[PDB]
Amino acid sequence: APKHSLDSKLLENDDDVLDTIKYVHKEYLGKPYPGPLKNPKAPEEGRLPPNEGPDRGPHGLAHTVRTMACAEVMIEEARKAQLRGETLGKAKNGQTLADVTPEELKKILIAQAFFVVGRDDERSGYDDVHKRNFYAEYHEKSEQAFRKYVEDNKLIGKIFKDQKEVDFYAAIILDKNHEWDATPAHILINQGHMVDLMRTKAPAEVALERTYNTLKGTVGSKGAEVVLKAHRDFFFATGAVVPLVNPEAIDDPSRGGPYENPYSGEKFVIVDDKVPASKKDLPKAVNRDYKLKDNERFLTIKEYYAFPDVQQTYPGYKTRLEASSYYFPTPFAGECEQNPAKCLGAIQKARSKLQTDAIKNGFQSSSEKERRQPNMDEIAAARIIQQIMANPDCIHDDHVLINGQKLEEKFFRDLLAKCDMAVVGSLLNDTDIKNIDTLMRHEKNTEFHSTDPKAVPVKIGDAWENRIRTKGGDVTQMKHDLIFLMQNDAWYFSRVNAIAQNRDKGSNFKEVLFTTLMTPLTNKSLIDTSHVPAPKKLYRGLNLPQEFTNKLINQSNAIIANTENTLFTDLSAEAFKQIKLNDFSQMSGKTCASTTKNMKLLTDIWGSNVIFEMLDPDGLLHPKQVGTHMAGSEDEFSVYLPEDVALVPTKVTLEGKTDTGEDRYIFTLVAVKSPDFIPRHESGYAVEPFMKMQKEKVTQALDAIEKDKDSYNIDEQLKSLRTEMVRQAKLPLREGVFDRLSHRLSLETSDNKISPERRDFLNQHVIPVLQECHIALRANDMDMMQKALAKFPTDKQWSAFKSGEAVRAKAQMDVLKQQIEKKIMLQTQIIPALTECGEALDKQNVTEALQALNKLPAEKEIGKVKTIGQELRGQIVGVKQELTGNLEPLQRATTTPIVQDAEKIKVRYETLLTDVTKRVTDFEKIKPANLDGYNKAIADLNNIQQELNLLRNEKIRMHTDKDKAVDFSDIEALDKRLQDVQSKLPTQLLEQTSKDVAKLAKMPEKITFNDIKSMTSKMNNYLETLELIRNDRIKKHAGSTDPLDMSDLDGLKGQLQTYNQSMADILLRAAKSSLDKIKDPATFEKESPYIKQCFDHLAELEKTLDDSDKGRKQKEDFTAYKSALMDKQEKAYPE
Q: 178: left (phi > 0), else alpha (psi -120 to 50), else beta?
């Protein structure tokens, strides 16, 4: 954590800088070039004509604004680079650009505003015609203008401390000797002006390289890239022209162009076309007016950048930059020159755009804005939630039972933790909204606890019904009432927000059930209610202890300091690594978060010490007004963060103190959407219980089916009818003519005698039919059943034989035919289909269940079979319809959206792998020597292990094939190397400690009390290191078969305690000699202070010394001498 904020944005907020810009623009800059005086001492002689166009093109207001913005960016980046830890350059005062306070920054900007207002024309340098130096005269005019301005407005005492400060800044502005590195102000003005003037010098590529080399030593390589990128953006925003940068002549010219230092005029001459191979091979540079002769040649830019050392050292060897006329932001710079506000707003816009685009380019681009289609498990969870809404009687006090299956608190909790709530809520409907009130009625008496331990428990159902439940409201009004319940934060909202993020501790089953039930329904209501013009800023309050706040501030500072919008190269890989490892947006929550537009309400009513400010340039957030605005105030909004939208910090400002005196911080967050933030999903976790319920329902259908099997004994009935008709065939012949006529025509219910006609009928048709049916029913040959029923005696034959016994037999055969067809339809369609869908649910295969569904017969086909009871028919049709309507949506969108940007992920993985390998090698290089190094190594190992976990997650995401295992050979190899280093480190530390202790044992021949103190301090340090090794050995060696050997460390401690004993012997000798040598109060005032100092040192020794017999003897001697001194004081000194 730095002592100053990572952000400096004076131009946006400050008043004095803007006032100074307005004054200078109204007085000097906003006027045509007047032309230099022909004679400075004689105005009457007139003026020379301006050397260029009278308009202030190159040095107008645009130049001043761009230079001031570049100076502010330079300080921005210098502070960032110091925070990252890489050393910066130093000016001759020994100060660093990160050490300039904001007050000096404001003074520097004010004194920079006057740097160019003195000019009269575009002449530069010494003039041969008049022997004059227009630069000095112009800057003298500027110095006089600055002095006049500072005197006129009485600025001294307001900003500047005294006259000497004004004189220092005047000497800065005058620039008599171009003292480029005297002090940070000199650098921050001069090199900023040079960076801005870079655009005019030609050739552009060499000028850009030289400017990079100038900025590198002062701010750093990454800073030398960021500043140039920002200045390019300012160039395009304000509307200047930029020459084309083309360092490898890709546009196919005859040559890249002669190499020439634009500021100095250096040119490299080769003698006889001997192309070199390194920069050091170049001979010394000739001057600008050197002539070529014979077969000599100028070094070409292409050949110069073909050299390898320049390629390695200077990153811009390969790059290519966009020309200005290609984008043609031309010529509205002349329009920007008319008013300061336009250019200042454009500068601020570009500055914000750079910072946002850095992060957005660091992450993957947004493939689509339309939301995902639901995952199979989310559809299952939505169905489960609706089914629970169906009835609350199935809810028990410590578990949820539904459709013959129970659910634990774990299921609801990890359903909340894992799955989306927005899509699941969107899957619900209004019948569930009414079932909400039904559930509230059922759960009237259950208790509820808030997060405040002193809060009185409340019955949630009673509270809802009395206060929340509006009298006879329509469904939309109940949705608004649910939002209204969300409004009452104190008693109910805290518990919900703590449960939904695992922050809860000690809540029972009904509270977690209510949370997982209410969150999707509340979000559903929020989407359904209304659309409101969304404000572009939101302030969210929070209350946190300082201990958490410091870590949060450090994480935000690291994230801000690592994101950079480089020009030449891409550091997107580092930004992605740093954001994921340190982001805190999971704390922002996955629930309805209450926000407001007005900071005043937060600072007055709540007085919270932590405030989040969210920006939504893309409109990714969709805040909604709080339902019924009739009672709901204007400044109350609810926001739901999707999973693929994450918040990242860009500003950390210390704004003020709370009424309790605690510092209040205000963060700023930019919402970014990217498929990279979609968490990995443990799919199928909730599909399993749903499949279990479906299987249970199918099994209950099978239960009813085998009950109907038990209902009829078809085999016995068929056998009985066969026996009866065999007996009928065995009857004596009924040969009476009238008997035959009555037998055939009339309902003769007396067939104890059979006519020959009906006997032949039976023998020919019924005997084969029933015998075949019986044989089939023994063998269960079912197509053979169908064939026999095709052989069945036609109703025409029974109409011929209308005897009453024949009619009864025909009725029995119709009953048996219906029973046989019922058995046919069951054992062919349903029972095999029920078994098949049982396997499919066991296999969790939707397609096989659907196939078994198609195999199942239709409802009307079952209705044809009258022998099937209406209860079983209804049950079977209900099973069919339920499985259809539950599985068909379940088949939809079984594939999660795919992260298809393979190139970006692969490149990022390769860069990260190289970086972590380099860091592991650097860790391997380490050899510790003390406790602090050991602790630093432990922390480094921990963060490297976290980086390896990040690598594991990225590698898992890189895995696209479903039928291959994910590889961790490289990551595990680095982990093994790190563990080997972890084993080696304590051994090296112990060896170094032992060697240093052996060195320390050499006591000096002559020892003084300060030597006593210093050598005791060294001994204490070594003893503390040995105690650290003791604790490490105790921690690690627990459970090992080897004994807890510490004899060697106890020997080292014995050496150190003998050291202590000898040193304490010297101390005690001196102290006792001084005590016995006391003669008077003067000798007391001389010795007793020294005696007491030695005795305090001896008490420190006793604290370090153990309770051994020799140690206790020394302690007893020290205590006896101290008691003698104390007695002498207390008694004799009053004497």
A: left
